């Protein structure tokens, strides 16, 4: 017996690992093409995310990838200083299709499972076997689990990147991984596993309007600008 | 389609790992309850054995065990200085039954899969969950492979521990993992992945007879003793 509510949900999980010959490494879990919610540099996990203990299968998958990259750098690609890989896993029922993306300093490679199409761009050296990744059998084996353990997180994150859940002051702050943009009529961009903040400051210049757009499809403006730093939700347009 | 000649062969593979808090470690592969043919301290592999490359699945199984033991010592058993584990895997067709044996300085534990019977002897501390081992799904998953890749090795090792393949001089040397014993009417015992040698020397004492017994079931004597170190095969009794 399986769950219908979790089988209906369709989302993409994005596992990405970066490794530098110098020593640097970074491995992250993202949801619905958003910003990362789980970050390793114990991981930095978001408040609306599942416990570290309940993310173990995804944890090892990422560690296997660090090792596989450290190994590519250890055996070949000696001029290349920074290799990187991204697995874009789409869940549509109990089946996963993971597209693999690789990036060295001199080459970019993409592969997609059904089309089997390998797109290679760059002067650099890469293997078409390496282009297709590994360890996908771990996500493909743990569909029911990963889906059920992430179903609350993946839709509560969407219900947070909503118009009535963003805070404009022009400093725009939405406590959701869903990416937004701010337009003025200097830009300080940042992040955190829990909050995303973009600030647009004018050096004495009169703007009178501040636009805000979301990747889930919405637009808003906050007018008139006040002398104080007062909090307000975006106003529809 | 499977192989009939490899399905017929019934043998026991014995995977054993030793780890000391001080740093020491030793992981070995044995066959038909004999002496070790593969030893890690690149492994020391026997001449009649399969290539390191064709033993990879058994290689990782052993490494998982080193880690699991290093972990038991890292989280508990602080008075205990040396933990050890042995998996006695019996292959009867395409099914494996692996009995697990553990040994700390203060406790001995045995477990057997069907009877599920856990035998614990000692004053020491052990977990009945730990007693049952892990990673057996690797040998149970790779039956066809392990069997086909080891079928020549497991029976050519038996056909070497034969009477007409032992060399008595009293120094007895049989180039086979099958264990033997030497009886005189000082004893220097040793080993190597390729040869087993037992020497029995007398300080001017007259023996006139030297007995040799094998674990496959045979007995022999070499008489009369010569003044020179001449090589001869055991003579039936």
């Amino acid at each position: 017996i399986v769950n219908p509510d979790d089988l209906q949900l369709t989302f993409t999980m994005e596992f990405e690992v970066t490794v530098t010959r110098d020593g640097f490494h970074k491995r992250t879990i993202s949801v619905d093409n958003g910003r990362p919610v789980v970050v390793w540099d114990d991981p930095k996990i978001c408040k609306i995310c599942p416990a570290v203990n309940s993310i173990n299968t995804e944890n090892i998958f990422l560690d296997i990838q660090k090792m596989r990259l450290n190994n590519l750098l250890a055996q070949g690609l000696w001029d290349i200083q920074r290799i990187c890989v991204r697995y874009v896993c789409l869940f549509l029922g109990f089946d996963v299709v993971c597209d693999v993306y690789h990036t060295t300093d001199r080459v970019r490679a993409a592969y997609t499972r059904q089309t089997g199409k390998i797109d290679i761009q760059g002067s650099g050296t890469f293997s078409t076997s390496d282009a297709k990744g590994i360890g996908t059998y771990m996500i493909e084996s743990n569909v029911r689990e990963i889906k059920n353990k992430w179903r609350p997180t993946v839709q509560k994150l969407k219900q947070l990147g909503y118009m009535n859940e963003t805070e404009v002051e022009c400093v725009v702050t939405s406590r959701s991984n869903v990416p937004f943009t701010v337009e003025l009529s200097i830009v300080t961009e940042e992040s955190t596993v829990d909050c995303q903040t973009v600030t647009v400051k004018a050096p004495g210049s009169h703007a009178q309007r501040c636009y805000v757009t979301s990747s889930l499809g919405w637009k808003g403006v906050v007018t008139p600008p006040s002398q104080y730093r007062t909090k307000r939700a975006p106003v529809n347009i | 389609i499977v192989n009939p000649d490899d399905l017929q062969l019934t043998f026991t593979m014995e995977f054993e790992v030793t780890v000391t808090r001080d740093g020491f470690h030793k992981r070995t592969i044995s066959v038909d309850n004999g002496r070790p043919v593969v030893v890690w301290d690149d492994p020391k592999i026997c001449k009649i054995c399969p290539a390191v490359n064709s033993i990879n699945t058994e290689n990782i199984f052993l490494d998982i065990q080193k880690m699991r033991l290093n972990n038991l010592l890292a989280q508990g058993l602080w008075d205990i200085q040396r933990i050890c584990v042995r998996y006695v895997c019996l292959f009867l067709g395409f099914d494996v039954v692996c009995d697990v044996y553990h040994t700390t300085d203060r406790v001995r534990a045995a477990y057997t899969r069907q009877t599920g019977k856990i035998d614990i002897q000692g004053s020491g501390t052990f977990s009945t969950s730990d007693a049952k081992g892990i990673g057996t799904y690797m040998i149970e998953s790779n039956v066809r492979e392990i069997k086909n890749k080891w079928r020549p090795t497991v029976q050519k090792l038996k056909q070497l521990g034969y009477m007409n393949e032992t060399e008595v001089e009293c120094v007895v040397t049989s180039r086979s993992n099958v264990p033997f014993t030497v009886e005189l009417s000082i004893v220097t015992e040793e080993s190597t992945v390729d040869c087993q040698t037992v020497t029995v020397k007398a300080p001017g004492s007259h023996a006139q007879r030297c007995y040799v017994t094998s674990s496959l079931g045979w007995k022999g004597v070499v008489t009369p003793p010569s003044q020179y170190r001449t090589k001869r095969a055991p003579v039936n009794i």
Binding site: I64, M67, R68, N71, I134, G135, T136, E140 | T57, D63
Partner: peptide, 22 residues
């Protein structure tokens, strides 16, 4: 370790084959 990566290589093959043989 190229040894573990060989085990994972082989495991994806066992997974891809076991699913195809149902």
């Amino acid at each position: 370790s190229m040894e573990l990566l060989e085990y994972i290589k082989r495991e994806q093959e066992r997974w891809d084959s076991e699913t195809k043989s149902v």
